[model samples]
Target: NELASAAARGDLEQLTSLLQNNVNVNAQNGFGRTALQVMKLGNPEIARRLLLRGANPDLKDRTGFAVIHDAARAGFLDTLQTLLEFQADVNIEDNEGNLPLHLAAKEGHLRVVEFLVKHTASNVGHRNHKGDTACDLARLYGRNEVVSLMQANGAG
Candidate 1:
């Protein structure tokens, strides 16, 4: 029932209707992305609704990007926490082997990086395809604000 269309457009009302009709929350769009995967990253209410309705946050899109990765990449701390509360995969890697933490670090999102290091199951030592860890990315991108946090959290 146009789950992809509604989600991609951030039309929560439409999504509510489709879901109430028993439409599969995990259904993929023609572009191979799920509703959750395509949802508004800044709208945790949308995330809560989908997760509450049993949408799988850990499900990866065609490129191996889960909902959490998108949240992390965009520095949406609330969305990231919501996904975690729903038990999204903390260590899930993207196609380039970047974990959620790696994306956060690369984006210079200090709080996001801090939360993942202190609270989540994120593997701080996880290196991306370029053979660089989250700490390395932080340093590489001149986002050194998080490098100390990474080091403090035992990031190798």
Candidate 2:
């Protein structure tokens, strides 16, 4: 609770204290959001600190979305890269079987899709619950650039 509050408020001092005092960096709230997740949106610096301190980037929230999922879907390329540097699984899927690539492509995040495909092991052919691959979502959403990129990258 202290970690979450400190992280959400961007209280670096308090957050550092909590972490240095042996608080579980991976501890999650009732909704399964860790301190890193709490700080990810507005306080990526703190989230990076948490990740450096061993927060599990792959931990999913109540909706089964991992930190990478949020970062990719929101087009937070820096945060997504940091998570990847910390070993977040590039292909981890949500409850709907939608990988970060799927979310990024569905939202027409071309840069994020390109970065994930190039830097991470995100499979372009990965499908969601509806059996729609990233390319399908991109095409359906009229993300022509993404569709072309996926096709060029070997996605059917």
Candidate 3:
């Protein structure tokens, strides 16, 4: 809670102090979220700091959401871009077996969808645990423009 709040507030100095004192940046809250997860919704700079300090982007919450998962779900495109630069796997799945592109499509984030499709070999046919691909999610959710965009990019 303390770390998550600090990250949200962008308290870099306090975050530095906490890290220097050996606080766990990947610590989970009651909701199975790390400070990195909160940072995905709040202050990504703090998350970047945590990453630079050796926090694991691949660490999952109890629900199997890595930092990249949270960033994707939160529509933090810039954060996800940074994660990609770190070589975060495009295939990493959350507890529900949703990938970044799946979440981005579910949330109607065309920019994120495009970025993922272009940057990674993320198969347009990749399905979530529910057996829905990016295109399927887009269509089911009435995101016609998203569906068109995904189709143009070869998303199934």
What TM-score would each prediction reach against the true structure?
Answer: 0.89, 0.86, 0.81
Q: List runs of model 1 lying over 4 Å from the truth.
A: none
Give lDDT tens digits, candidate 1, residues 1-156. Answer: 398778778888988888788888888767767788888778787788888898988887777788888889989999899988988888998999999999999999999999999998888887899999999999999987799888877874
Best by lDDT: 1
Please write out the lDDT profile of model 2 over residues 26-64, one tens digit for every residue.
887887677887873746677778988989888887778
Q: Give lDDT tens digits, candidate 3, residues 36-147.
A: 7666354656766788776677877667777777777668887787766666687888777788888888888888888887768677787788888878887888878778
lDDT score at residue 13, model 2, on the 0-100 scale: 86
Give candidate 3's TM-score: 0.81
The TM-score of candidate 2 is 0.86
Colliding residue pairs in candidate 3: none
Name the runs in model 2 displaced over 4 angstroms: 30-32
Better of 1 and 2 by lDDT: 1
The candidate that achieves the highest TM-score relative to the unseen native structure:
1
